[PDB]
Amino acid sequence: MPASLQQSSSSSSSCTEEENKHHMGIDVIIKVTKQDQTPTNDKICQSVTEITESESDPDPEVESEDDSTSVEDVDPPTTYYSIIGGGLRMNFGFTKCPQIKSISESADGNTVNARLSSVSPGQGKDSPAITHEEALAMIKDCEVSIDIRCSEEEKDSDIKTHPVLGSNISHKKVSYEDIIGSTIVDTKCVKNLEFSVRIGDMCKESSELEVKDGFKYVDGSASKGATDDTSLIDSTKLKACV
C-alpha cells in the first residue's frame, strides 16, 4: 500500500496548474496491410530497441557531434526505435519531438497496427510541461521519419499484462502541420499503409497547440487527406510490447 504519496505537483502525479504551461505529448498510430503473398505472422511485440544520438556532449563516439564546443546553442539528437513484430520491422526517428514512453502493438487478420505515443500526467511516468513559446517552437521543428521492412524473426512475443498508457489525446481533425518526414516502404511486404500523427496538450486541448497530419498509402497509391483517424484502429486491442 505505497502510502508514500507521489506528492502532487510532480508532472507524473497530475497536470500542472501554471496557466502558461502545458503537457505537450505526441501520438503516432499506423495501420499496415500485408500482401496476399507474405506468410502468416501474428507474433507481435517481438522486441523493441531504443536508441538515441550521443546527445548533449558526454563522449562523441569518434567525432559523432560538433567535435568541439557544445554549450547549448544547437545540438538536436534523434531517438530511433525498431519495434519488430507481425513479420514486419517498423522503425522511426523522432527528432525534437516529445519523449515517447508508450509502445504497443497488435495483429488482426492480414494487417498489424502500432501505437507510438507519450504518456499523460498521472500514469506513473514522467510527462514534462513547457510554455506556449517552446510548444509552438517544438510543434514546428518536430519531425518523425519512418522506414518499414520485411522481417522473418519467428521469435515469441514479449508483452506485459499491464494496460497501455494513452496520451489522452484524440486523433480528431484539427490544424494541419507537416510533421511526417521521410517514409520508405518495401512493397515486398506492405500493400497498404496509413499514417496518422498528432501533437497537443495531454491535459486539455488548446486548439493552437493542437495539430495533425497523415497520408493514405494503398497499392502504391499515396494521398494526403486530413480525416478523423479516431477509429483508424481499435485502441483496445493494443498490447504493450515493453
Binding site: 538536436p76 530511433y80 527528432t95 521519419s145 518526414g181 521521410s182 512493397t187 497520408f215
Partner: protein, 69 residues
C-alpha cells in the same frame, strides 16, 4: 537470371524539414527512377535513412561534399 516482374520500389513520398548537420551524415544514397518524383536520401548515425528535397542548395552542397572527402 530472369529479372522479377514489376515489384514496386522505394520512392520518396515526403522530405524532412530539419537539416541534419554533417556530423550526423556519414553516407548517402539516391532513390530510383521508376518514380517520376525522385530525390536524394542521406544516412546518419542514430537513425538509418531519410529523404531530402534536392531543391535546397544545402542538400546539394552536402552531396558534393560526400562526393569528395
Amino acid at each position: 537470371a530472369p529479372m522479377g516482374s514489376d515489384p514496386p520500389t522505394a520512392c520518396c513520398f515526403s522530405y524532412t524539414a530539419r537539416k541534419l548537420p554533417r556530423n550526423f551524415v556519414v553516407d548517402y544514397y539516391e532513390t530510383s527512377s521508376l518514380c517520376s518524383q525522385p530525390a536524394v536520401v542521406f544516412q546518419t548515425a542514430a537513425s538509418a535513412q531519410v529523404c531530402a528535397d534536392p531543391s535546397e542548395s544545402w542538400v546539394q552542397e552536402y552531396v558534393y561534399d560526400l562526393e569528395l572527402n
